[PDB]
Design a protein around this ligand. Structure first.
Ligand code: HEM
Ligand SMILES: CC(C)CCC[C@H](C)CCC[C@H](C)CCC[C@@H](C)CC(=O)O
Ligand SMILES: [Ca+2]
Length: 426
């Protein structure tokens, strides 16, 4: 299409990045383009598989102690499967948890079992493979309407993939599951965007705004919950207010935190898998060709490889409950430990040809949904289906859809985000 992005050779390894150029506790490092980032993690995996880092500043948050970065696959996996040692309390981002933040962000993702499991059971039936298989009809026609409207909205055949499809599809689905009405979708989207875009001047850099948005979304969850308290609807919000996770009902804060976890995770995750997928297809059109020629035959492995490639969630943090030594590095009880999924997903000792984007890759033990165990992504089956249906609807309405500019990238250490990706089609 000649308006298109330049092609790229598949299996191209990243630039050489000297260790002296790697500074994970600087925001400027997260600004560097993706190739240099991948290069920097390659250097770490080889020369400092476990290394220590001061935690990033950014206004209004509390950096506190630094963290031991696990950049190897086997260590990320080991840490995920040993939660007695690598605890999710008190926080799964690198910054210290505060009681003010805990009002909105003290959900089960920052708790250990047995309380974590008891909370998780409240909503987990809805995310089961049997059940996500049953909402294919809702997914399909949100996706189909979005691709149609992408076409109708754009006589020029020039659109932003992010706001026209990748963004609103996983948003509409999670809000529908929560029971959030249509008129509120956009406001919800703008809130989770600021929550998980903090540090990026296109999203927010003033902590006052972050606190306001948090309060607004917490206030919003509370009002919806209270509604559902009196009038059951058959949405996840009703399950939340009806639950006893205990022999006790959930507190306001527990409801607010659970609501915000679902909606943020639902809104700031699969949209990036989808946008990175389209970009990757734009760079490697042989891959686009193979998949379009055999959509259903290649879909299971295509969807996993888009997730491996995008690694939408860059890292999660844990905290040691006891001393432990790994790979010859002694770490102490109370130390922060960060699990770099984006690095595990390029690990030369687990993946042949880690730099090759291969929609037929089989097996594909990636850690895009984390390393397995107690906090395994609750939305994994939902996300896979969202991804599959989105590309299915593109393949059938605009099969040659293709990026026309490099993406505007989210400045973020936690989320491999794309803010906008101009695409074209014929
Ligand atoms: C490609 C899309 C997605 C990716 C890559 C992803 C990634 C992750 C990762 C890395 C974790 C932490 C896992 C661990 O600690 O071992 C997680 C947890 C979680 N995710 Fe997903 N996520 C995605 C989509 C979604 C969706 C659509 C939802 C729907 C609400 C969702 C809901 C959750 C929840 C609730 C948790 C916490 C589970 C728990 O603490 O037990 N995710 N996700
Ligand atoms: C599956 C994933 C994407 C769900 C994560 C959802 C929950 C709501 C994460 C909490 C987000 C926190 C409060 C944002 C702060 C991160 C940042 C400021 C850390 C730092 O200072 O370096
Ligand atoms: Ca347009």
């Amino acid at each position: 299409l000649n308006t298109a992005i330049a092609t790229r050779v598949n299996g191209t390894p990243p630039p050489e990045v000297p260790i002296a150029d790697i500074e994970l506790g600087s925001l400027d490092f997260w600004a560097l383009d993706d190739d240099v980032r991948d290069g920097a993690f390659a250097t770490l995996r080889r020369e400092a598989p476990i290394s220590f880092w001061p935690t990033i500043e950014l206004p209004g948050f509390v950096a506190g102690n630094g963290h031991w970065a696990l950049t190897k696959y086997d260590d990320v996996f080991y840490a995920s499967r040993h939660p007695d040692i690598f605890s999710s309390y008190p926080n799964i981002t690198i910054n210290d948890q505060t009681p003010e933040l805990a009002e909105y962000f003290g959900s089960m993702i920052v708790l250990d079992d047995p309380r974590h499991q008891r909370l998780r059971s409240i909503v987990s039936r809805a995310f089961t493979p049997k059940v996500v298989a049953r909402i294919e009809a809702a997914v399909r026609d949100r996706a189909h309407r979005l691709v149609s409207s992408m076409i109708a909205n754009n006589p020029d055949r020039q659109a932003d993939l992010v706001s026209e499809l990748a963004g609103p599809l996983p948003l509409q689905i999670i809000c529908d599951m929560m029971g959030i009405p249509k008129a509120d979708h956009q406001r919800i989207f703008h809130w989770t965007n600021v929550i998980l875009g903090f540090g990026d001047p296109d999203l927010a850099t003033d902590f006052d705004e972050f606190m306001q948005v948090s309060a607004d979304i917490g206030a919003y969850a509370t009002a919806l919950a209270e509604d559902r308290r009196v009038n059951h609807h058959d949405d996840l919000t009703s399950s939340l207010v009806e639950a006893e996770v205990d022999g006790e009902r959930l507190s306001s804060r527990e409801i607010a935190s659970f609501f915000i976890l679902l909606v943020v995770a639902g809104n700031e995750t699969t949209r990036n898998a989808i946008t990175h997928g389209v970009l990757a297809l734009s760079r490697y059109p042989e891959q686009r060709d193979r998949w379009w020629s055999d959509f259903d035959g290649l879909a299971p492995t295509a969807v996993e490889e888009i997730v491996r490639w995008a690694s939408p969630v860059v890292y999660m943090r844990r905290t040691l409950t006891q001393d432990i030594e790994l790979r010859g590095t002694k770490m102490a009880a109370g130390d922060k430990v960060s699990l770099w999924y984006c690095s595990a997903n390029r690990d030369e000792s687990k993946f042949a040809d880690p730099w090759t984007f291969d929609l037929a890759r089989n097996p594909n033990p990636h850690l895009g949904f984390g390393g397995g165990g107690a906090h395994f992504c609750l939305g994994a089956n939902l996300a896979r289906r969202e991804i599959r249906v989105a590309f299915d609807e593109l393949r059938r309405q605009m099969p040659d859809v293709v990026a026309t500019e490099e993406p505007a990238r989210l400045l973020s250490q936690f989320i491999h985000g794309i803010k906008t990706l101009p695409v074209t089609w014929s």
